[PDB]
Every structure is written in C-alpha cells, then in structure tokens.
Amino acid sequence: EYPTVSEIPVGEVRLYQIADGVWSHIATQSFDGAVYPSNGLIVRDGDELLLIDTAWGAKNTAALLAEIEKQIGLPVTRAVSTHFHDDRVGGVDVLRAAGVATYASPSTRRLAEVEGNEIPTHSLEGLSSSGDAVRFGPVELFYPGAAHSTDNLVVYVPSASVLYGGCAIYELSRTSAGNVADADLAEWPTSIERIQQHYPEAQFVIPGHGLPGGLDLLKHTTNVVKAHTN
Ligand SMILES: [Cl-]
Numbered sequence: 001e002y003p004t005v006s007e008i009p010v011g012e013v014r015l016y017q018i019a020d021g022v023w024s025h026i027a028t029q030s031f032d033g034a035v036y037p038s039n040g041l042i043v044r045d046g047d048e049l050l051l052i053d054t055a056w057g058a059k060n061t062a063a064l065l066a067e068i069e070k071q072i073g074l075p076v077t078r079a080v081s082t083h084f085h086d087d088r089v090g091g092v093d094v095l096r097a098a099g100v101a102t103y104a105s106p107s108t109r110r111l112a113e114v115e116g117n118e119i120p121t122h123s124l125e126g127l128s129s130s131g132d133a134v135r136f137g138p139v140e141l142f143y144p145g146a147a148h149s150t151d152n153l154v155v156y157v158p159s160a161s162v163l164y165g166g167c168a169i170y171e172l173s174r175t176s177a178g179n180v181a182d183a184d185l186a187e188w189p190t191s192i193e194r195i196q197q198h199y200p201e202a203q204f205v206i207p208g209h210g211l212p213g214g215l216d217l218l219k220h221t222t223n224v225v226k227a228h229t230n
C-alpha cells in the first residue's frame with residue numbers, strides 16, 4: 001500500500017492519500033550510489049491545492065505536477081518548502097514557471113541563497129522563534145526550533161490530524177542518523193518535544209523519508225539523535 005522505491009521508477013512520482021483531502025507525494029533520487037525515497041505533502045484548500053515541499057529536483061517536480069494534474073485535477077496555487085535543502089527547494093523554479101506561488105521563511109530563503117540553492121519567492125513571517133506557529137490556509141506551520149536544520153518547519157493539518165515532520169522526523173526503519181551536517185544535534189530533542197507538546201492529538205505522522213506512522217516516530221527520532229550524539 002504505501003509506495004516504496006520498488007513501485008517508483010527514478011524520475012517518477014506516486015501520490016498516496018493519508019486522509020480526506022490530504023496526500024503525500026513520493027519520489028526517489030539516487031544519492032552517493034544508493035536510491036532513497038522522499039516524501040512531500042499535498043493538502044486540498046477549497047478548490048485548489050497547497051503543496052508542501054518539492055519532489056527533490058526539477059525533473060521530479062515537473063512529474064509531480066503532471067501526476068497531480070492527472071489524478072486530482074485541482075490546481076496547485078501555493079507551495080511551502082520546509083527547509084533550505086535541495087530535496088525541499090529543488091524544483092522551486094519549475095513550480096514558479098508553472099504559476100505556483102512558492103513560500104518559505106526568511107530563514108530558509110537566507111540559507112538557500114547562501115547554499116546557492118533555489119529560493120522560494122514569498123516569505124513566511126512569524127516563524128523565527130522556536131515555538132512559533134502561523135496558519136497557512138488548511139494547515140498550521142510550526143517552527144519547533146533547530147533540529148535536522150536550523151530552519152526546519154513542520155506542518156499540521158488540523159482537519160485530518162496529520163503531522164508532516166519533514167526531515168526533522170525519521171521513519172522507524174532508519175536506525176542511525178542520516179546526514180546531520182547542518183543539524184543542531186544539541187537542540188534536536190528539545191525541538192521534537194515542542195512538536196510533541198503542540199500536537200499531542202496527531203494521529204498520522206509523516207517522516208521526510210519513508211513510512212508514515214504515529215507519534216511514536218518522535219520518540220524514535222529522539223532515540224536515534226541521542227545515540228548519534230553519543
Ligand atoms: Cl536527506
């Protein structure tokens with residue numbers, strides 16, 4: 001049922017419905033020899049769609065839109081990148097070209113530019129302090145504090161109790177820390193706890209990569225982060 005790299009050819013994207021009016025988009029990308037899956041979110045906003053994160057690359061993102069256009073038939077009007085890394089903003093130029101309004105916090109935009117990555121056009125204000133939350137259409141955007149990256153945001157769909165953690169949250173199968181180069185290992189557990197305190201009602205938790213689960217993914221990530229820290 002949940003698509004894996006198996007049911008997904010490199011360059012293609014698969015959509016998966018998590019709840020009413022909420023889907024995850026799944027793509028793949030080779031990386032240092034191996035192939036990894038990657039999740040993004042899609043949330044119905046009236047008669048249009050809010051996209052959370054790119055499909056990790058221009059080709060992948062063009063396929064994501066095509067796969068959305070021919071499967072939901074609702075237009076993607078806005079998109080939010082949860083952090084400055086390539087797997088989240090890579091494809092933003094494609095989204096922009098297609099008329100999608102791309103958004104990110106000033107922190108993410110700043111880091112993206114410094115990194116030489118694509119830069120979402122619009123700015124999400126009011127997410128600069130750990131614990132900050134702001135509404136964006138059908139979802140709530142939350143800055144839990146530095147974790148996988150200093151700018152990582154998490155997304156909650158109050159109507160469906162869906163929490164999209166992006167790369168700040170690991171799937172159960174991920175037993176060791178991934179790339180923590182731009183991570184704040186010291187603050188990661190505390191940021192996870194703010195996510196826990198703010199969304200204890202979440203029923204579905206989507207990791208940036210891999211299989212969705214419940215709130216237990218938070219403690220799992222904490223376990224993995226602590227083990228790596230030591
Ligand atoms: Cl990654």
Ligand SMILES: [O-]
Nearest residue numbers: 085086087167
């Ligand atoms: O990432």
Ligand SMILES: [Zn+2]
Nearest residue numbers: 083085149167
């Ligand atoms: Zn990242």
Ligand SMILES: [Zn+2]
Nearest residue numbers: 101102121122
């Ligand atoms: Zn605009």
Ligand SMILES: [Zn+2]
Nearest residue numbers: 087167208209
């Ligand atoms: Zn990632």
